[PDB]
Amino acid sequence: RQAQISNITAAKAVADVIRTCLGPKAMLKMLLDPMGGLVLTNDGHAILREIDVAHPAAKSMLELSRTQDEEVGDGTTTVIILAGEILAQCAPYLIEKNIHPVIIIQALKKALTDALEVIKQVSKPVDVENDAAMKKLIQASIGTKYVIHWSEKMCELALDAVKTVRKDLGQTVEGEPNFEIDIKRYVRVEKIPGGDVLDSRVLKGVLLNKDVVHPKMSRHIENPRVVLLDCPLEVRPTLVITEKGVSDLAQHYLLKGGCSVLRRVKKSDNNRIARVTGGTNCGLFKVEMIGDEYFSFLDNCKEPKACTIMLRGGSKDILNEIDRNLQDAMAVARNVMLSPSLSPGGGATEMAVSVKLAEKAKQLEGIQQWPYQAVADAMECIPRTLIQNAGGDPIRLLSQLRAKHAQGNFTTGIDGDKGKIVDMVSYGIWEPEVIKQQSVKTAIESACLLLRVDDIVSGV
Amino acid sequence: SLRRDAALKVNVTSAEGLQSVLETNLGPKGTLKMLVDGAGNIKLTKDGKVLLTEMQIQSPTAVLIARAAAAQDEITGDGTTTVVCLVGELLRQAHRFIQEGVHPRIITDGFEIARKESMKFLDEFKISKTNLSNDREFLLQVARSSLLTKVDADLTEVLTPIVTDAVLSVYDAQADNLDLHMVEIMQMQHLSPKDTTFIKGLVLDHGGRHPDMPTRVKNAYVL
Amino acid sequence: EKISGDDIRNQNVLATMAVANVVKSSLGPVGLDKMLVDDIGDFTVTNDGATILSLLDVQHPAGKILVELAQQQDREIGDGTTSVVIIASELLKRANELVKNKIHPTTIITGFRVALREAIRFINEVLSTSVDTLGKETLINIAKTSMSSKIIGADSDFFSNMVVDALLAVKTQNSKGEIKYPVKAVNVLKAHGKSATESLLVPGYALNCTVASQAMPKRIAGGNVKIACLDLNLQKAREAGIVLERVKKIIDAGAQVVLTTKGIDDLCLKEFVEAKIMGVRRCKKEDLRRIARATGATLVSSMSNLEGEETFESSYLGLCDEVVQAKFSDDECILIKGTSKHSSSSIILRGANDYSLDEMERSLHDSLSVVKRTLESGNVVPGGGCVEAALNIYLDNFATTVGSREQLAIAEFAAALLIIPKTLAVNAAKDSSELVAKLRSYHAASQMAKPEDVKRRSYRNYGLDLIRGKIVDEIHAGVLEPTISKVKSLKSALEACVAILRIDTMITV
Amino acid sequence: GQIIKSIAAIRELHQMCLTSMGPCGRNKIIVNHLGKIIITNDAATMLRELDIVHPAVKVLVMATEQQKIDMGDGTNLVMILAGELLNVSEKLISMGLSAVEIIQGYNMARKFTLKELDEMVVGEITDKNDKNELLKMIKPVISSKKYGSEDILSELVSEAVSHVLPVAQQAGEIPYFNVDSIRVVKIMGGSLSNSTVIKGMVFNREPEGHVKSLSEDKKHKVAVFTCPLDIANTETKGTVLLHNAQEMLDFSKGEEKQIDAMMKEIADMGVECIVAGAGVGELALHYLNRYGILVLKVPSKFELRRLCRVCGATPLPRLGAPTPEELGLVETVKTMEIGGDRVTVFKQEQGEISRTSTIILRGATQNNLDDIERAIDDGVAAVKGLMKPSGGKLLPGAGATEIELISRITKYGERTPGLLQLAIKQFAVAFEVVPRTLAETAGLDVNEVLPNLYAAHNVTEPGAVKTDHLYKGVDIDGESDEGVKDIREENIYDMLATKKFAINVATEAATTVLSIDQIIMAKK
């Protein structure tokens, strides 16, 4: 039974340290490196990567933070703390009560479905087609950053950036595609120095920096046809694009054929060209120079769900700050398109599940009823952690907040600025449901895997 | 079976040790500290930032204190020791409130609220001085503030006209700015510090060696 | 150093105890995964007990014997390695207890060898082929429990009847009456027609394609029809005189069904209208290779062989009954039944959307894998503890028939088999003391009237179901194991146990 | 964190009492420093034979004696419940809830429990004092102590109680049953089936005379003499000495004539039994055999007190003055062989109803013989609980009471707003130790019986009024069973006076421990 305690305390010590990283009031942390430097930032994703751990269960929690950070921008520490508290509340049940671990694991699988159904009832509908409403939802990830001066322009740029990659399609014939939104590959951006932030537009297609290889050639084609190939030159298409370079000999041979030669094209861009091409039905071939650099337009009249966003600004340092800020802003807007629902923040959603779980578990009357109380207590620790960071009494503010759910609504959370129980909807505090769905599901799934290992095998 | 860790009692105390060191040398009545490398290097400096670069501190609390002065020398250029005294003493005054159960966020947020209110009182307390070039008589007393701090005040009267006339000679009267890079500092030993004088031009290293070279030449052409 | 005496015998028990604890929690499907950490600091996550023993680092003369024992079961059977280590571990613990009883190790070894030969004979008496096909259902519960982790498991009750009946007739003599089921057969299609429960079993080959121009009749040659499998296209070759000669050899050969991988042109299609020949455009190459074996035809590489050009009439034409095209919703397929020799069939799954059918088609092949492996061996035995529990009681009364200091070795050998159902119920959270005890009570009265060839309430083959937490027959529950797996696992487990007990001295420089 | 370690020190002794309560319980052998082995199953008696180190444990020991002195039953319920109240409070003390509001929560939960105890009464004892009616109260008392003797000892204890109680009804002014009315004696040999019930004290000593027993005459006169039998002399000194052989014949014959003259006046008054608390001379036993007077010597002053309440005899400070006013009357006294040895017992017939009885025990096991001696004493205090303070009311036992209180307390938890909800919920969970202890010691799985106990008292009935079976308790099994069984079959009930008194003592016991945040000690 000693191995079960070591498996719990492995993720328990890591979770207890990052408890102060949750919320806008999160306290700063200080790590001591062997070098004279130190890490003063409170970001949980940066701190967990610099911590060296021994027990392998702590390494599994670090891999969960890396996967959670790729899906959504924030809420990385919420998943680790929630998964660590479940093992702490189930520690006396697994050890002192002598309960079989699969019974706890089987109960967590049933509690995972019940936790998702409560969040769907607490969530409220939202209009995803309103352009003015989406700018306010993204604004939560805009303000309190260097882009606050451009926040008016950032909300418009991040709006068209999300609307570009997404495509709305649904039916019962081929199923639900879920819009097939990918931020990494498809929303990948190319930074162009110079220009203006307001003038920056989102173009659908692949942007190349190579110009025409011939001095006299047509710069505008009615119906251009893009053709991709591998082997360099050294159907009668209207354009010829080569991945590698093209010798000057092939320039005159293809000149009489009425096609343009374009060399030096990256391999990663050729995969995205197949989305806009497959080259018929190509909208605009215009090569017009922008920012003292010759460009090319592969765009069209269609929505392939693949593109390269053109970013412009006052300098390269400005584009570097917009880069990581735009990806975090689109992650919040992406969760809005995954479903037209929003959940109250500040711990209101965390308390809404704990209240409904305790009432539903009493009607089951089974062996799984006991670990449900441990899950309900773990759901209350997330808003209680913010109370400890807000200076308020964690004993008094937790009991008074739980009693209000039985009378009032489930949208009443805790404010970071004030520190007293207040309503999230009226005071303008909102969070998407997808973060709540990924926080509960991944924490329970990771907590079950840690309890499945009763022995640590040493060997190669 | 486990509740928190209380923490603290390590950063405040470590910052109190740095305060007691830099409390004695602050101001014109301060003391002149001496550091020893061990290779034969001996430097006597009353500035806080200059000494922190030659001292290695294992405590990470004092590391950020030395890094906080990095923006002070590149912008303000003076008062690096005064800033450290305000950081250390603020922790001692807040130490009594932490033991009483006051949460540090209210202590932290209470400092930012008082900081914004201090900026409003800062603009009312300041005095606007004209840009006219007749203020050189008033600039003599202003230059003494920086001079009297780093010396024993015996060399202040000698260095007062040198520092004052160095900036005003290269500065025409307009908004513009002043560039201190055009002022070069050279040193030669085997002489007393009271012989320091002001040089309008540039000093050259290698001089002409010959008995018949004229010592004084008036109104000469440079080629 | 040189050691001997009771010290080396105690180290052999402590060595196999730590090895058994590694595979103790991994036994059975209810087992749980473990982590293997090296000195580099990396780790791995797997639930397979065979891969754990391969990377398990143990320094011990008897411990390395179990390492080679684990590799012997993987290179041959590939399954049951976890159960072999547990059996050999309990035999060493009970053999060391006989040292204080003044029992000689050779008698312990001889007592196992004599009992092992007689145990296989008793196992061969309860072996039976596939039964309960009429009046009961066996193979149905196999696909039901395997699909319980997928959405298809809800409708798997209706879907299992189509898979079991199909595969039942797929068996053929192969080479000299082998009766070995193929690893890949019954190509599964998809359609949007109606709901998921409306899927119908088609007793025959089914190809997904259309007739292109509808001017051709969909049903022709009811009595007899010949299907022509041609990889070479009838379309104009990139020229008009060659493609007309290829069609001339078709209508003259009497082939009412023509399959072309690259399609058929419009000019060559007009000749098929007057001859009532059904053409198909854009055939799949992977589909037509199986048609040659199902319809008795042969894939035609090219018509340019030697100096002649022709389709080799009657040589590549297979015997079939009738080719009829039934109207289906969404995509329409082709029904081919009554060929020369097929014995196979096809399953067209109709459902709401293809998103769910993609998960059902992949789960169907995974569920079919468990079915085809069990049916591969015509001689099977019920598992779930039926082998260890039934043999435990039989060796109790049989141990008296031998005697002469060997009865104590047989009694300890039989009681050592109860550890398999014991540790199996540990991962299921069920009490292992009550299940193993009550399991012996049911088999005790079951073998009393067995040799009398008369029975009333006496039934054999009681298993252990850990999913529902009750004692039921594993034959009807869907848990079956081949004879090759159990015989080689029990015989090889004793081979490694003997070599450990024969070492009285360890010499290490 | 001494308040946590103080609970851990009690936790070491908590598991000791968990192995006591219940039919699986067992006595503990303790060897005293004087070389005496005391063996008893009762945990309250064991606490007096154990050396207590931590002074915080003595608080629970002093609270345990409160249960034994007054009610005499439920000592295991007080110590075990008080130990669990500290474990459920350990989570509250750590959670950050102050121990002040923890104490305030128990005071509010205690008043809510006392009001519900009056509504949980099912049956009521009519105090008929019938032999069959006493079998319902005595059976659970013998239960959870010694197994297999509950059927035999039920008829032996209930028979001795009906002998000392007069015939009365609906009168609570004058008390009748005391704690000394039942004496327990033991003798080697025999079994429990051969044991009988005596209506009076039993003397296992020898008569010390040639007269084995008296006659069958009605109302035998018994006289208790504190002065020893000898010639009357001066109270101060008065040592008989012989100076010469001439005074030898006068002093020897003088003692013969003086004693015979005093014994003649006693026999003429009709006194056939003389009780001498002091030693008896040689010449005294010779005259008592001719007059047919039974010789009885009781040096213990405690046995003489219960004898005066039966026949009515009084001890006389002098010798030779048989005052008939202070003499006692016994119907029948006989000397019979019970248990293999001939002993002279004391009993009655009709008149002069005895207020004190003695039960004779027989058995071949010496260890179990002393265990029954301590088990009957716990049954004596059970009869005392039949008085006016809720003597007739009863509550279902065998774990049915502690589980049913969970649903009623949690119902009042959400009703009372504020921080008291933390202590109210933990107060009901602390009652789960009683059913878990009986299930764990019986070998039953916690994952099996425990979830069936919660589903027994909590069901969904299509109606406002409760129905189906509310009598389902905790079953020890031991052979086989499915689920639980009804308690009304075996008629195992707990008195309200015992259960209500045990809750208030256990509440104040845990209140004292939680209120102490510091302990100051000094070496001796």
From Swiss-Prot, chain A:
Organism lineage: Eukaryota, Fungi, Dikarya, Ascomycota, Saccharomycotina
Protein name as catalogued: T-complex protein 1 subunit gamma
Keywords: Acetylation, ATP-binding, Chaperone, Cytoplasm, Disulfide bond, Nucleotide-binding, Phosphoprotein
GO cellular component terms, semicolon-separated: chaperonin-containing T-complex
UniProt GO molecular function: ATP binding; ATP hydrolysis activity; ATP-dependent protein folding chaperone; unfolded protein binding
Gene3D superfamilies, per the entry: GroEL, GroEL-like equatorial domain, TCP-1-like chaperonin intermediate domain
Subcellular localization(s) per the UniProt record: Cytoplasm
PROSITE patterns: TCP1_1, TCP1_2, TCP1_3
One Pfam family in the UniProt entry: Cpn60_TCP1
Family: Belongs to the TCP-1 chaperonin family.
Function: Molecular chaperone; assists the folding of proteins upon ATP hydrolysis. Known to play a role, in vitro, in the folding of actin and tubulin. In yeast may play a role in mitotic spindle formation.
S-S pairs: 301-307
Curated annotation (Swiss-Prot), chain B:
TM stretches of this protein: none
Superkingdom of this protein's organism: Eukaryota
GO molecular-function term, one example from the UniProt record: ATP hydrolysis activity
Cystine pairs: none
Signal peptide (UniProt feature, chain positions): none
Subcellular location: Cytoplasm
Family per record: Belongs to the TCP-1 chaperonin family.
Name listed for the protein in its UniProt record: T-complex protein 1 subunit zeta
Natural source organism: Saccharomyces cerevisiae (strain ATCC 204508 / S288c)
UniProtKB/Swiss-Prot annotation, chain C:
Compartments it resides in: Cytoplasm
Pfam families tied to this protein: Cpn60_TCP1
PROSITE patterns per UniProt: TCP1_1, TCP1_2, TCP1_3
Superkingdom of this protein's organism: Eukaryota
TM spans (from-to): none
Molecular-function GO terms, alphabetical: ATP binding; ATP hydrolysis activity; ATP-dependent protein folding chaperone; unfolded protein binding
One GO term of the biological process aspect: protein folding
Gene3D superfamilies on file: GroEL, GroEL-like equatorial domain, TCP-1-like chaperonin intermediate domain
Keywords: Acetylation, ATP-binding, Chaperone, Cytoplasm, Nucleotide-binding
Primary location class: cytoplasm
Any one cellular-component term (Gene Ontology): chaperonin-containing T-complex
CDD domains given in the database record: TCP1_alpha (cd03335)
Protein role: Molecular chaperone; assists the folding of proteins upon ATP hydrolysis. Known to play a role, in vitro, in the folding of actin and tubulin. In yeast may play a role in mitotic spindle formation.
Family according to the record: Belongs to the TCP-1 chaperonin family.
Subunit description: Heterooligomeric complex of about 850 to 900 kDa that forms two stacked rings, 12 to 16 nm in diameter.
UniProt name for this protein: T-complex protein 1 subunit alpha
UniProt source species: Saccharomyces cerevisiae (strain ATCC 204508 / S288c)
Source organism phylogeny: Eukaryota, Fungi, Dikarya, Ascomycota, Saccharomycotina
From Swiss-Prot, chain D:
S-S pairs: none
GO MF entry, a single one: ATP-dependent protein folding chaperone
Keyword Nucleotide-binding in record: yes
CC per GO annotation: chaperonin-containing T-complex; cytoplasm
Keywords: ATP-binding, Chaperone, Cytoplasm, Isopeptide bond, Nucleotide-binding, Phosphoprotein, Ubl conjugation
PROSITE patterns: TCP1_1, TCP1_2, TCP1_3
Highest taxon of the lineage: Eukaryota
GO biological process: chaperone mediated protein folding independent of cofactor; protein folding
Localization, UniProt: Cytoplasm
Pfam families, alphabetized: Cpn60_TCP1
Phosphoserine sites (modified residues): 480
Entry's family note: Belongs to the TCP-1 chaperonin family.
NCBIfam families cross-referenced by the UniProt entry: chap_CCT_theta (TIGR02346)
Subunit structure: Heterooligomeric complex of about 850 to 900 kDa that forms two stacked rings, 12 to 16 nm in diameter.
PANTHER family with a match to the protein in the record: CHAPERONIN
Described function: Molecular chaperone; assists the folding of proteins upon ATP hydrolysis. Known to play a role, in vitro, in the folding of actin and tubulin. In yeast may play a role in mitotic spindle formation.
The protein, known as: T-complex protein 1 subunit theta
Species the sequence originates in: Saccharomyces cerevisiae (strain ATCC 204508 / S288c) (Baker's yeast)
